[PDB]
Design a protein around this motif. Structure first.
Motif, PDB file in Angstrom:
ATOM      1  N   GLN E  86       0.845  -1.192   0.000  1.00 15.97           N
ATOM      2  CA  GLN E  86       0.000   0.000   0.000  1.00 15.97           C
ATOM      3  C   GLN E  86       0.885   1.249   0.000  1.00 15.97           C
ATOM      4  OE1 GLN E  86      -2.788  -2.486   3.137  1.00 15.97           O
ATOM      5  NE2 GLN E  86      -2.950  -0.230   3.140  1.00 15.97           N
ATOM      6  N   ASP E  87       0.347   2.344  -0.559  1.00  8.73           N
ATOM      7  CA  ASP E  87       0.940   3.667  -0.451  1.00  8.73           C
ATOM      8  C   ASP E  87       0.417   4.467   0.734  1.00  8.73           C
ATOM      9  OD1 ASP E  87       2.412   3.272  -2.847  1.00  8.73           O
ATOM     10  OD2 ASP E  87       0.674   3.995  -4.025  1.00  8.73           O
ATOM     11  N   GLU E  88      -0.803   4.162   1.157  1.00  8.78           N
ATOM     12  CA  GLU E  88      -1.438   4.814   2.295  1.00  8.78           C
ATOM     13  C   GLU E  88      -2.014   3.692   3.151  1.00  8.78           C
ATOM     14  OE1 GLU E  88      -4.171   7.390  -0.048  1.00  8.78           O
ATOM     15  OE2 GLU E  88      -3.243   8.924   1.191  1.00  8.78           O
ATOM     16  N   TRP E  89      -1.931   3.828   4.472  1.00  7.78           N
ATOM     17  CA  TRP E  89      -2.128   2.703   5.362  1.00  7.78           C
ATOM     18  C   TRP E  89      -3.355   2.790   6.260  1.00  7.78           C
ATOM     19  CZ3 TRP E  89       0.652  -1.600   4.327  1.00  7.78           C
ATOM     20  CH2 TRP E  89       1.820  -1.422   3.584  1.00  7.78           C
ATOM     21  N   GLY E  90      -4.216   3.765   5.998  1.00  8.86           N
ATOM     22  CA  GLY E  90      -5.479   3.873   6.736  1.00  8.86           C
ATOM     23  C   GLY E  90      -5.287   4.256   8.190  1.00  8.86           C
ATOM     24  N   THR E  91      -6.077   3.615   9.048  1.00  6.22           N
ATOM     25  CA  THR E  91      -6.034   3.933  10.455  1.00  6.22           C
ATOM     26  C   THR E  91      -4.951   3.132  11.170  1.00  6.22           C
ATOM     27  OG1 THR E  91      -7.599   2.238  11.013  1.00  6.22           O
ATOM     28  CG2 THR E  91      -8.554   4.300  10.460  1.00  6.22           C
ATOM     29  N   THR E  92      -4.682   3.495  12.430  1.00  7.92           N
ATOM     30  CA  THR E  92      -3.794   2.681  13.247  1.00  7.92           C
ATOM     31  C   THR E  92      -4.255   1.234  13.231  1.00  7.92           C
ATOM     32  OG1 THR E  92      -3.268   4.573  14.632  1.00  7.92           O
ATOM     33  CG2 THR E  92      -2.628   2.406  15.434  1.00  7.92           C
ATOM     34  N   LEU E  93      -5.578   1.006  13.332  1.00  7.39           N
ATOM     35  CA  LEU E  93      -6.088  -0.362  13.319  1.00  7.39           C
ATOM     36  C   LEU E  93      -5.744  -1.060  11.999  1.00  7.39           C
ATOM     37  CD1 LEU E  93      -7.703  -2.641  14.535  1.00  7.39           C
ATOM     38  CD2 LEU E  93      -9.746  -1.426  13.823  1.00  7.39           C
ATOM     39  N   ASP E  94      -5.991  -0.380  10.876  1.00  4.75           N
ATOM     40  CA  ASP E  94      -5.675  -0.956   9.579  1.00  4.75           C
ATOM     41  C   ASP E  94      -4.215  -1.334   9.516  1.00  4.75           C
ATOM     42  OD1 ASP E  94      -8.285  -0.602   8.356  1.00  4.75           O
ATOM     43  OD2 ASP E  94      -7.746   1.485   7.876  1.00  4.75           O
ATOM     44  N   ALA E  95      -3.364  -0.423   9.993  1.00  6.07           N
ATOM     45  CA  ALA E  95      -1.927  -0.603   9.919  1.00  6.07           C
ATOM     46  C   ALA E  95      -1.471  -1.772  10.790  1.00  6.07           C
ATOM     47  CB  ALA E  95      -1.213   0.677  10.296  1.00  6.07           C
ATOM     48  N   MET E  96      -2.012  -1.860  12.005  1.00  2.00           N
ATOM     49  CA  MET E  96      -1.606  -2.932  12.898  1.00  2.00           C
ATOM     50  C   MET E  96      -2.101  -4.290  12.355  1.00  2.00           C
ATOM     51  SD  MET E  96       0.281  -3.130  15.649  1.00  2.00           S
ATOM     52  CE  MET E  96       0.169  -1.452  16.281  1.00  2.00           C
ATOM     53  N   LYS E  97      -3.284  -4.318  11.726  1.00  4.62           N
ATOM     54  CA  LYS E  97      -3.744  -5.558  11.093  1.00  4.62           C
ATOM     55  C   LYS E  97      -2.812  -5.948   9.947  1.00  4.62           C
ATOM     56  CE  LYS E  97      -8.825  -5.328  11.851  1.00  4.62           C
ATOM     57  NZ  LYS E  97     -10.056  -4.713  11.297  1.00  4.62           N
ATOM     58  N   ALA E  98      -2.391  -4.981   9.127  1.00  5.34           N
ATOM     59  CA  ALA E  98      -1.463  -5.296   8.031  1.00  5.34           C
ATOM     60  C   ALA E  98      -0.145  -5.808   8.577  1.00  5.34           C
ATOM     61  CB  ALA E  98      -1.262  -4.094   7.160  1.00  5.34           C
ATOM     62  N   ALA E  99       0.322  -5.239   9.680  1.00  2.68           N
ATOM     63  CA  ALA E  99       1.564  -5.654  10.290  1.00  2.68           C
ATOM     64  C   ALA E  99       1.474  -7.077  10.817  1.00  2.68           C
ATOM     65  CB  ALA E  99       1.936  -4.705  11.381  1.00  2.68           C
ATOM     66  N   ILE E 100       0.362  -7.449  11.450  1.00  8.03           N
ATOM     67  CA  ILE E 100       0.292  -8.797  11.976  1.00  8.03           C
ATOM     68  C   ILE E 100       0.181  -9.812  10.812  1.00  8.03           C
ATOM     69  CG2 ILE E 100      -2.182  -9.116  12.406  1.00  8.03           C
ATOM     70  CD1 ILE E 100      -1.371 -10.151  15.207  1.00  8.03           C
ATOM     71  N   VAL E 101      -0.508  -9.462   9.729  1.00  7.59           N
ATOM     72  CA  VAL E 101      -0.541 -10.322   8.548  1.00  7.59           C
ATOM     73  C   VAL E 101       0.897 -10.519   8.026  1.00  7.59           C
ATOM     74  CG1 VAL E 101      -1.271 -10.426   6.125  1.00  7.59           C
ATOM     75  CG2 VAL E 101      -2.925  -9.774   7.954  1.00  7.59           C
ATOM     76  N   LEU E 102       1.637  -9.434   7.907  1.00  5.67           N
ATOM     77  CA  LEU E 102       3.031  -9.480   7.478  1.00  5.67           C
ATOM     78  C   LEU E 102       3.843 -10.380   8.398  1.00  5.67           C
ATOM     79  CD1 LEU E 102       5.439  -8.572   5.776  1.00  5.67           C
ATOM     80  CD2 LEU E 102       5.417  -6.427   7.063  1.00  5.67           C
ATOM     81  N   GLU E 103       3.716 -10.197   9.695  1.00  7.87           N
ATOM     82  CA  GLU E 103       4.504 -11.001  10.611  1.00  7.87           C
ATOM     83  C   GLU E 103       4.124 -12.481  10.575  1.00  7.87           C
ATOM     84  OE1 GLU E 103       7.220 -10.030  12.129  1.00  7.87           O
ATOM     85  OE2 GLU E 103       6.957  -8.016  11.374  1.00  7.87           O
TER      86      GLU E 103
END
Ligand SMILES: [Cl-]
Ligand SMILES: [Cl-]
Ligand SMILES: [Cl-]
Ligand SMILES: [Cl-]
Ligand SMILES: [Cl-]
Ligand SMILES: [Cl-]
Lengths: 174, 174, 174, 174, 174, 174
Positions: E86-103
């Motif tokens: 993504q170029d833009e990561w939405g809310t803190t919640l969106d970002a933390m969900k993307a991070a846990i998927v990544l991890e």
């Protein structure tokens, strides 16, 4: 389902909860051993202190397992804790023999859980046991064996003398 | 020929290499003694520590001989190292008797090499042995003799008690 | 039988004793390498110091194995120690090549023992090797390889110059 | 009979053993509360830390009772420890309400034992409870009540926000 | 061939290079997450700092893998690094969900490489992952899960308020 | 539109994002250079350390550009990162020549962006480059040129000797 859980089987989760129960039972056994040796009619302070330290050590093992359960996304479940096998623990020799039997049982439980984790291709579980439990357990059993041999050497035909000497000269006291 | 070697016979050079072998053999014997007393079914920490220290002490003696060989322009030559004479070492008394026999054999080898050096008019060799080996060996044998006497005194008819007491009250341990 | 031994096969116990022999043999090889480079007609102090350090390092590995043998309730058994493969070790390059051959042989022995422990479901053994031996061995072999490359680079057609430079500028000396 | 016991009734001795069981049960309840709040799907660190501290505090109370039992010449007797009343503890509010119910039950047990000691003219028992238990218990219940009020104030119609805020701004955390 | 390589398969060597790519991709993702939260129209400093720290942490993981590749005698090979998802990561919640998927994706890659090493009887590889990666990854995923729960709790119907509060009171900032 | 952006053209914003890509590509090139020189069959620690430091230095340059992009109210946009131009980097001389080519390309990009900013009457951009990039780049290129000359001087007809000497006596190592 759990948002973190990954590669963590229901079998391991259950076995971890059982192992917590075993460590808490062991801790409770050591509490009882310690207070027996604190009795005015037993009065072996170094023996009391040895088993009280083990009570805390086993409680810490249970804490580590519970922390790990949560880190993996399993659910800690607590069961009733059976009372220790004896109300009175006999001589230092009797007590140290009961302790090594207890520790061999805990060690076998560790080995069984490690085998389950290996079968389940759960390397985090296997590493956790190897890194925090297996060597500590081997070290403790060796220590207990060393103590048993020294206690046995001191029985001879002056048992009370030997029991005193062991407590005074090997075990840590004020 | 060697650019430094002076007044250093082939006989001395060979005997120095043989002496290195004897010291390394002694070191190995003491390693075995130490690990025997570390066994869970022997468990005499002060005895383990005594012999482990001697293992290092004999290794250091070998190192000094090898350094000297090179300083004199001889050639260090290593041979196979025979295993120790026993796999199991009996009681502290048995072990200390074996150790003093070993040390008397090393001392005789020192004395023999000193006599060879004297016959060869090799004063550097003679001084090296006198300054770094002969007195250390006499001191060690005296210590071992002192220990043997105390161990023997403690046998009486309560052998296990005496063996414990000696380890606890004479030998250095945690 | 042993009062502490648990999950410790006779196969592992024997292989541990064999591995001790291999480490002590390696230590002895490094002692010989060190004293060769200390000769007045070789005189490469940094090379002497490198191999003397490895002699001590391998002795420490043997000590750790022996400690572990006792902790597990096996019986340390010592065999004769074969002398090193050479009396004279050639150039720094020759010596470093012999050392890496030696280390690859020790590493294979480690890997073989790990495989035996895995087959025997002996996780304490496997963890002991992983935690105290395998990475140290990989690190050492990498270091030796780095050294071999630098030595090889310096041969050119001015071998003596390169051998001096390597000893002075890479290896640790006074 | 006991060589030290004096003015220490069988009724008090038994009630002390029952009280130990109650404190250990309370400790176990707090262990469960703490690990619930440590779950990744609950994740209230200050709540986890509050209850983990109480688990230790109740264990210490049990230790003091057991020490006293021995000082008086009674016999510590351990019974099975029932598991906590719940596997999952709901909200911070639910948990704090369960904790105050638990503490009121412990306080009543303290008061009952004090009344028994008074009836039995056992002033050492009465002083022991007054000096080490009664005020500590009143202080703890007051603290819990203060917390309940603040939690209740924060429910409003934004329950999650209030639960976070309480944990962050009242309870002790990293 | 390589002068150091031993017991190091081509399959592991390739998978290590792929894993380096995954860690560098993850690092790059976290760089992008960090700078998004640094925007004047997002402005959540604690969130920026959380992801910038993870960018460095993943870079360090890549460095460790590359060091290990060389220690084993494999050849580090670098591939193109795909841009973040993504170029833009939405809310803190969106970002933390993307991070846990990544991890979770990185964790699965770790587990897959561990299984390959186990199949190949490569204990150094398995120990390297266990000792430096698996537990760190479990710890990180647990932390992220804890954060997700707290973020989710704070959404309610005052999302902006909760997002501010989380950043101010949980995440580390000036 | 942006609430802070002022005097910041779309052309500059895009060119800044391109420059970030170039610096990250350069950083990646230096990571590859560093790990090549860490290989056991290359083994030039000072060269490894030189390029690893440059990898970090270029990453820091990218970070500064990204910080500036946000300070100006532009939007950081990340693109795929091309792998380095080579998998193997030849000699120290080859590597240092590739590095100076890389740096001249980065310098030209800096100069081009400065010219764009000047044309756009963007003095903040121009000052940012002058203050944090242009002189650092000139200093680095001068250093590399100094190194190239010393490497070239040392080739002669003893290339391996000269390559060693340069690494030992000019570049920073343990
Ligand atoms: Cl039940
Ligand atoms: Cl032979
Ligand atoms: Cl034989
Ligand atoms: Cl029962
Ligand atoms: Cl490509
Ligand atoms: Cl793309």
């Amino acid at each position: 389902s759990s948002q973190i859980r990954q590669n963590y089987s229901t079998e391991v989760e259950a076995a971890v909860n059982r192992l917590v129960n075993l460590y808490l039972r062991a801790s409770y056994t050591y509490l009882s051993l310690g207070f027996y040796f604190d009795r005015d009619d037993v009065a072996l302070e170094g023996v009391c202190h040895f088993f009280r330290f083990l009570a805390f050590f086993k409680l810490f093992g249970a804490f580590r397992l519970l922390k790990m359960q949560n880190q993996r996304g399993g659910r800690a479940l607590f069961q009733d804790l059976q009372k220790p096998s004896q109300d009175e623990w006999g001589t230092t020799l009797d007590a140290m023999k009961a302790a090594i039997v207890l520790e061999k049982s805990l060690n076998q439980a560790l080995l069984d859980l490690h085998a389950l984790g290996s079968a389940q291709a759960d390397p985090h579980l296997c590493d956790f046991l190897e890194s925090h439990f297996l060597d500590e357990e081997v070290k403790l059993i060796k220590k207990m064996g060393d103590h048993l041999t020294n206690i046995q050497r001191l029985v001879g035909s002056q048992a009370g003398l030997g029991e005193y000497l062991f407590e005074r000269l090997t075990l840590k006291h004020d």
